[PDB]
């Protein structure tokens, strides 16, 4: 259909140029809606044609921007759902589509309320007069921290980000909550890593070996936490699970214009100085203590068990 093609093209262009919605949940919802629209208003009779069309669309969307992983996860989940529906109906070429719509709706109603389930576990992990250290702006981490402030009073330390100081918005949002937070630069992460009793940070995606791809500078925070034996616990939703390994892709840290680091008005020295501005870092799984999920806190060594039931191993390449 013309509407389907124009919607796909618009989504691809807006993802490649400057990205879509800011929040990951909105991106996941938009991807699920696009996939449901593709499944509904299309001509097909065999499940294989739908599977290959979905695979091609997911490959195109992934090639549009490799830094994001939510679209790939949605495509993999849709493919797994289609495979499971075909297996159930065969172990059926005209009514299976209704099962796909029902399963897509079930995934949507499981997904959009993930934050409530994540935040319903803050009492067991946050105590009174406990220092909490965080870096960057994470909606899930903000909801986790702001939900437990009603019952208990604690101290929160917020670390900014040198390229884009997005941590100040989180700091002021938490300050306008009766939480008594504080902010500081990135150079004092190790200097104040003595009285911090717990560290809660977010992430963009989770690798197949339990590794994380968070904002830049999180590796230093994890190293300091390991040095001082302070546990580092990450609360991430279930849709940020990427079944892939860091196979030297070199695209793990996407680079942006060096304007944010060095101003263009520096002078004639810009022709010789080489400036790199990465936004993401690699965190080994050995520096992670716990992973908050909708099914409760899980160890970093339990990610493969969830992957075995989430994504089919034949769709890992996409």
């Amino acid at each position: 259909g013309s509407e389907l093609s124009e919607r796909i093209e618009s989504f691809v262009e807006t993802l490649k140029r400057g990205g879509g919605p800011r929040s990951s949940e909105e991106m996941a919802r938009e991807t699920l809606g696009l996939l449901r629209q593709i499944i509904t208003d299309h001509r097909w009779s065999n499940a294989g044609e739908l599977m290959e069309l979905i695979r091609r669309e997911g490959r195109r969307m992934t090639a549009a921007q490799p830094s994001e992983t939510t679209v790939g996860n949605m495509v993999r989940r849709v493919l797994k759902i289609i495979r499971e529906e075909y297996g159930r109906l065969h172990g059926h070429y005209a009514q299976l589509q209704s099962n796909i719509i029902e399963a897509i709706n079930e995934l949507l109603v499981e997904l959009e309320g993930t934050m409530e389930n994540i935040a319903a576990q803050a009492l067991e992990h946050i105590h009174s007069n406990e220092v909490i250290m965080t870096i960057g702006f994470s909606r899930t981490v903000e909801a986790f921290l702001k939900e437990a402030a009603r019952k208990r009073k604690f101290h929160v330390i917020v670390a900014e980000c040198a390229p884009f100081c997005q941590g100040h918005e989180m700091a002021v949002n938490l300050s306008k909550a009766g939480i008594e937070t504080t902010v500081m630069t990135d150079a004092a992460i190790f200097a104040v890593m003595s009285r911090v009793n717990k560290v809660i940070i977010g992430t963009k995606t989770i690798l197949a070996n339990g590794a994380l791809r968070a904002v830049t500078g999180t590796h230093t925070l994890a190293l300091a936490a390991k040095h001082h034996s302070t546990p580092l616990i990450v609360c991430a939703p279930m849709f940020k699970l990427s079944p892939q390994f860091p196979n030297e892709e070199d695209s793990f840290h996407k680079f942006v214009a060096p304007e944010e680091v060095l101003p263009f008005t520096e002078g004639d020295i810009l022709e010789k100085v080489s400036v790199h501005c990465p936004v993401f870092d690699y965190v080994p799984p050995e520096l992670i203590t716990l992973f908050i999920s909708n099914i409760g806190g899980n160890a970093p060594s339990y990610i493969y068990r969830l992957m075995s039931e989430l994504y089919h191993p034949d769709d890992h390449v996409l």
Binding site: E124, H127, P231, T289, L290, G296, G297
Partner: peptide
């Protein structure tokens, strides 16, 4: 037990 614990205080 379906419980997660880190320290002997909770």
């Amino acid at each position: 037990c379906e419980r997660v614990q880190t320290d002997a205080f909770v």
